[PDB]
Amino acid sequence: QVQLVQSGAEVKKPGASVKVSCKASGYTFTSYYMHWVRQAPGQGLEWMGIINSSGGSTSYAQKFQGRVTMTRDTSTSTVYMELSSLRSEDTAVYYCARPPRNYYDRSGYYQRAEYFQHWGQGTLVTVSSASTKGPSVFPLAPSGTAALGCLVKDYFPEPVTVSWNSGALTSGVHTFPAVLQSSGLYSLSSVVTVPSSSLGTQTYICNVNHKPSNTKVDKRVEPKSC
Amino acid sequence: QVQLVQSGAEVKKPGSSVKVSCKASGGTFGISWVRQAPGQGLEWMGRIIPILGTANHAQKFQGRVTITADKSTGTVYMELSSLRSEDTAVYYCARDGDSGSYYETLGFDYWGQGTLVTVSSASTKGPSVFPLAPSSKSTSGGTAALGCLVKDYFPEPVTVSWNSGALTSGVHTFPAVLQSSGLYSLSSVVTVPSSSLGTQTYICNVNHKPSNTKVDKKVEPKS
Amino acid sequence: QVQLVQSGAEVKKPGSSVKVSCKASGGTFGISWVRQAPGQGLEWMGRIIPILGTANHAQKFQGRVTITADKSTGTVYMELSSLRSEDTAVYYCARDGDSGSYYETLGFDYWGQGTLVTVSSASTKGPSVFPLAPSSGTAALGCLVKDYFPEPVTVSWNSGALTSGVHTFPAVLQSSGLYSLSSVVTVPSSSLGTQTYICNVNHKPSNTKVDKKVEPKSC
Amino acid sequence: QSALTQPPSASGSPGQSVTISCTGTSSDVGGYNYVSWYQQHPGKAPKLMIYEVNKRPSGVPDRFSGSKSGNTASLTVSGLQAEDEADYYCSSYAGSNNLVFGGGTKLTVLGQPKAAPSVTLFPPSSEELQANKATLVCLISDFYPGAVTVAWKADSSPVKAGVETTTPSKQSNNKYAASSYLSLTPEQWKSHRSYSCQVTHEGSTVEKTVAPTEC
Amino acid sequence: SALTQPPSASGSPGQSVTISCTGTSSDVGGYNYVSWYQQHPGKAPKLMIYEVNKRPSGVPDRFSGSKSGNTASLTVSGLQAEDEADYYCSSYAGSNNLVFGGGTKLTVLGQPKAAPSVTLFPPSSEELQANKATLVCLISDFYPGAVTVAWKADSSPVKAGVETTTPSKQSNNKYAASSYLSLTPEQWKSHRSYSCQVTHEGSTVEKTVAPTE
Amino acid sequence: DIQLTQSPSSLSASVGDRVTITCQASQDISNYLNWYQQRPGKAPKLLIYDASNLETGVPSRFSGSGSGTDFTFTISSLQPEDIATYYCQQYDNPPLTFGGGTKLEIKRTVAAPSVFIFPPSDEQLKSGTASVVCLLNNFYPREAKVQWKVDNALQSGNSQESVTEQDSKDSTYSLSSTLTLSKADYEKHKVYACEVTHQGLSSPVTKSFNRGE
């Protein structure tokens, strides 16, 4: 199994620099090129550059030339990408990607094969003045099949990871997109519909994880008995 | 154009065998090998004249040294078998006379660079590279100091370059430190104009051959 | 009227010897020297009491520092030999007590201006001066002192007759190892046609003196 | 041994009092009572503030008060003002023919009005163009804090080659100043519509443009 | 072993140093294949004298070899700072046997003391993110090669977690040493400032460093 | 820089429909084109490489063709799990570029939402703010009107809505209306109602609750 795990989402003040990590496992690291791809919220994909995991040779796009730097560590099988002089446009998700190995033609022509088979999970870089804040988790209690939920209020920045029963519940889970409140903080809700019969039989725990604030909150949703 | 280029930075477990090569460039009558233990003195090992076919050994290395040469490639090999902790040393080539003059002066004109052969039981480790960032303390003189810390590696040696070798002015790579843990650590500093701190990127390249570890590291001022 | 006037802006090759003078004005018991490397901190060098004849050195400068004084001229000299790149610094005089009170307070009351001694192999390179003209109510005129070595260079306006609104920016050490700076002055636009504005650049290491007239460009 | 440890960064707020420490040993600061405190503004000569364990010389405000305790001297600045933002060094008697200075403490006054950078862009001179050289000059003054980023644009597009930007330095008025020079050829200068110097500071940006003149 | 070469000869500029290399009749006394090599620390040996008295192409005339009975002797006449290196002698001990000497560390005396240039680097953010911290204190361009390093926590000495290298000669004939203080992020962020103090020939140089939050 | 234009930019098709997207290049790249299927929240997934080759693990219903400047990407029968944004990418000449994207949606039968209400938690009331939540689960189409009535008085400028992406199974939507009030203002009134009007609803559905029950 091939696996690319990237570093946690970060928030940085405008003009600073971000470093995103991408750790490869499940293949010999030093045998493939690593490419970086940025995607602004709502926009499309935008290419950043290529780095050679063996020697460290690097080729950046003209758009990022002078502001992006790609680093490599063979011992830990990781790739770093640093973007400096951030602006509001740089708020985006950053992916690493591995293409297959470049081959030689029958004639001896170097044929590049730059299609991306394996991607990372993505690292959100929020470019913002705003101070980081930890979330508050609150239970949405239910009164055939009933629906319960968890409210993740007043957190910054994006995103939060919400699972149910440590991942043991995926059927009928709806984690709503975040909403930017008037206070400049985010808020999100995650609901799940379960049969009423299981309201007393199975316990329902929601796990909220906000990595930028190092906050992990488990919350058991129990019906309020009036 | 009479230089001798010595290959290898090999690490070998006790009891194994190591083979070191010397490439001769220009005219070379005979090539001799001389070993030097770290901190200790020089000791002679053997001599070969490829044009004649004779080879010599010191008495202490009887049965352990094999000196060969391939004329097609123009190279000379020296193999030491049954290695122990006593053999951990630097191995040099030496020229004995020019391509003519079948005489041997027993003075070795041109020497190759070091070839360190570390013989140890202990497992190789590989380095951890960290950037040593400049401050107003180091930068305000018009010249700032950047650095790289190569921590907790074994064994020697590690090669540290800057910008893939494109920066040599003001580079000072300090000698390693043998920690209590039996692992090595070193630092490499560079003096660069402060004005270029924002324009030019400064990457340090660390290469540990025994572990096949190559690490780039960007040194930037901490905001 | 108890000011200390320090001479010199000397440049010396490694291994040579430099001699810096301090002229004492008013009463001065003893004069000490303190050096400061660019960006770094202060360090003490030595002290002399001309009325007594004694001199001191720090242990690190044993055999390298010679502090002398001539009473006829009222000046005090300090000579540092065997210079290296570590010595490149600014050298200050310091008063240690008034003309009376043979006590030493070890607090230095009045300090002279900077004396920069740059120790380097590299040959001096003398400046190129260019006028920076203002384009379109208060305008900025300037002089660009490009590609000179070493520091310092002195930029004045109208032979020193213009000090109001003068800002001489710090030098830049380029990739080429040469210095460059700019000196700007803020002046009312109304005076652009009435008064002439000359900038005077003086680089003592190269004995270079350049006047330059800054006016707005024509057709 | 016999050195002095002065903590590099002390900061305070207006009206408050800051205590700067200067720690020695028994042989230098602990044993004898010859301690001095000097204040130095960047670019200026040091000035004496305290000349003994505790003695203010003629012309030093009463706000600055020296003291000593064991092996540690301490300078206390009362009624902090913006003028007090400087480097403070301590000196002590280390023995006959030995005087020791400290590392220095960069005192930062906390009341900070952030100020936009004042930018002035100068095109190359006729004399320089007649010497087959060109230099754009971008001068930045009166900004706070001392953290700006300079970018050069050729009509729209960034230029990263031939740029030399100085490190920000503190002015007399407690604000910061920097310069940035772009060395170009007359060809590059006269082959573009306009050049621009952009200064980014605390999220804000200031752009100055310049174009060639012919007739 | 096998030869007696006095480990530690010394001299002064302009003066002459004679380094001896004593053997027996069967190695040094009998035959005229004697060689003197000069080796600067960290570099490969260079041939200075071969066949007793022969200077190879490019060796200054200052180095003059000689022999007397069972003792060869290398004489340096025009002593300069650059001559500060290790000098080995080699000789023919018989067919298929070449014997080297113990080496002589030639010290030139005249030189002016050089104060140590010290630079102190705090831990990196990357290192702190790995639950470790290391202060780096680099000392360069001092003479002689004898310094003592001390670490202070705000005022107080720290004797644990210090690793200081032995001073080694640089290319410019001066000495350099490094000293690493391994600490935990807790200890690093819990103190006002750390300091590296370098004592050299009675003088002292202190460098301090504080965290940035 | 090779520009790629994607047609269309958005589209809606029924289950089992045949779908066709076009990617036009500003220059000629023989077949150095790839197609990616980026699902909401997830990373891009490579489906077609070299403009005609199916990636290992992709269903047979996907295909690609084209050359020169014109390429096409085809779906035989549109399955509900195919809803994503599809991008085209070139690698004939640096730098690599991507298409604008093609947001593909499903045309589904009209479904009515399940409406639930959640009063503010006893824990949140400790903090001063109160949040009342209204959930509209599994409906279509995307349009839906949600009104907050506090004591039958319409609240405005106090609610925020969040709508999920189209479900990969049943191709429905879900909506969350959060009404945030102060504890003082929350305790001022008694009856909190959420009124949902949707196309699939004959009459507006109201889910209410009385404070403190």
Tell me the residues of chain B between 70 and 89 that have a Cβ less than 8 Å away from chain E.
none
Q: Are residues B173 and B207 in the same domain?
A: yes
Q: Are residues A65 and A96 in the same domain?
A: yes
Q: Are residues B10 and B115 in the same domain?
A: yes
Q: Are residues C71 and C172 in the same domain?
A: no
Write the burial class of residue E4 (CB in 10 Å: 0-12 exposed, 13-18 middle, 19+ buried).
middle
| E-strand stretches of chain E | 10-11, 17-22, 34-39, 46-49, 63-68, 71-76, 86-94, 97-100, 104-105, 107-108, 117-121, 133-142, 148-153, 156-157, 162-164, 168-169, 175-183, 194-200, 203-209
Neighbouring residues of A103: CB distance < 8 A, sequence distance ≥ 6:
A111, A113
Contacts of E138 in chain B (CB under 8 A): 147, 174, 187, 189
Q: Which CATH superfamily is domain E117-209 in?
A: Immunoglobulins (2.60.40.10)
Q: Are residues A45 and A88 in the same domain?
A: yes
The sign of the torsion formed by the CA atoms of E92, E93, E98, E101 equals: negative
Q: Are residues C112 and C156 in the same domain?
A: no
Q: Are residues C92 and C72 in the same domain?
A: yes
Distance CA D74, CA D67 (A): 5
**Angle at D70 (CA atoms; ends D68, D71), nearest 5 degrees:** 90
Q: Which partners does chain D have (≥3 C-beta pairs < 8 Å)? A: A, B, C, E
Least CA distance to A14: which residue of chain D?
Answer: D203
Least CA distance to B135: which residue of chain D?
Answer: D167
Asked if A31 is an interface residue toward chain B (Cβ–Cβ < 8 A), one would say: no
Distance CA B114, CA B80 (A): 16
The CATH number given to D118-210 is: 2.60.40.10
Residue A226 lies in a domain: no
Q: Are residues B99 and B170 in the same domain?
A: no
Q: Are residues F131 and F195 in the same domain?
A: yes
Closest to D211 (Cα-Cα) out of D166, D133, D162, D153: D153
Q: Which two tokens stand for residue E101?
A: 């000497």
Residue A63 lies in a domain: yes
Contacts of B211 in chain A (CB under 8 A): 75
Closest to E179 (Cα-Cα) out of E212, E210, E143, E205: E205
**Angle at A67 (CA atoms; ends B161, A55), nearest 5 degrees:** 35
User: In b/e form, how buried is each residue of D15-36, taking b as 16+ CB within 10 angstroms?
Assistant: eeebebbbbbbebbbbeeebbb
- The total number of residues written for chain B in this structure: 223
Q: Is E11 in contact with E76 (CB distance < 8 Å)? A: yes
CB contact under 8 A, B216 and A71: yes
Domain with residue B50: its CATH number is 2.60.40.10
Can you spell out the DSSP letters for A82-133? Answer: EE-S--GGG-EEEEEEE----EE-TTS-EE------EE---EEEEE-SSPPB
Domain boundaries, position B212: 128-218
Asked if A16 is an interface residue toward chain B (Cβ–Cβ < 8 A), one would say: yes
What is the number of other CB atoms lying within 10 angstroms of the CB of residue A30? 15
Q: Are residues A20 and A95 in the same domain?
A: yes
What are the C-alpha distances in Å from A188 to residues A66, A178, A180, A215, D88? Answer: 38, 5, 9, 15, 51
Distance CA E141, CA F162 (A): 66
β-strands B11-12, E162-164 pairing? unpaired
Closest to C151 (Cα-Cα) out of C199, C112, C204, C200: C204
CB contact under 8 A, B111 and E101: no
Q: Are residues C44 and C106 in the same domain?
A: yes
Asked if C39 is an interface residue toward chain B (Cβ–Cβ < 8 A), one would say: yes
Print the SS3 string covering C80-132.
Answer: ECCCCHHHCEEEEEEEECCCCCCCCCCCCCCECCCCEEEECCCCCCCCEEEEE
Number of H helices and number of E strands within chain D? 2, 18
Using CB atoms, which residue from C38, C39, C175 is nearest to B193? C175
β-strands C166-168, C65-70 pairing? unpaired
For chain D, domain boundaries: 9-108, 118-210
Distance of alpha carbon A212 from the chain centroid: 11
**SS3 for B137?**
helix
User: Are E10-108 and E117-209 in the same CATH fold?
Assistant: yes
CB < 8 Å & 24+ apart, contacts of C69-76: C69/C31, C74/C23, C74/C24, C75/C21, C75/C22, C75/C23, C75/C24, C76/C21, C76/C22, C76/C24, C76/C31, C76/C48, C76/C50
The CATH number given to E10-108 is: 2.60.40.10
Asked if C173 is an interface residue toward chain B (Cβ–Cβ < 8 A), one would say: yes
Query: In the PDB record, what is the listed experimental method?
Result: X-ray
Domain count, chain A: 2
Closest to D78 (Cα-Cα) out of D36, D17, D35: D17
**Omega cis (within 30) before C14:** no
Distance CA E66, CA B104 (A): 20
Domain boundaries, position F24: 4-107
What are the C-alpha distances in Å from D127 to residues C140, C144, D181? Answer: 19, 12, 17
Distance CA F63, CA F11 (A): 18
Q: Resolution, rounded to a tenth of an Å?
A: 3.4
Tell me the residues of chain D between 122 and 181 that have a Cβ less than 8 Å away from chain B.
147, 149-150, 160, 163-167
Contacts of B44 in chain E (CB under 8 A): 90, 97-100
Q: Is E66 in contact with E53 (CB distance < 8 Å)? A: yes
State the first-to-last Cα distance of chain A, in angstroms, to the nearest integer.
51
CB contact under 8 A, B149 and E56: no
Closest to A159 (Cα-Cα) out of A173, A139, A179: A179
Using CB atoms, which residue from D4, D7, D72 is nearest to E193? D7
May I ask the CATH architecture of the domain D9-108?
A: Sandwich (2.60)
- Nearest 10 degrees: CA dihedral of F108, F114, F120, F123? -90
Using CB atoms, which residue from C60, C64, C86 is nearest to E203? C60
Domain with residue F170: its CATH number is 2.60.40.10
Q: Which two tokens stand for residue A80?
A: 């770093």
Q: Are residues F87 and F19 in the same domain?
A: yes
Distance CA A120, CA A34 (A): 11
Probe site for chain A from F135, F138, F156, F171 (most A CB atoms < 10 A): F135
Q: Which partners does chain E have (≥3 C-beta pairs < 8 Å)? A: B, C, D
Distance CA A112, CA A116 (A): 12
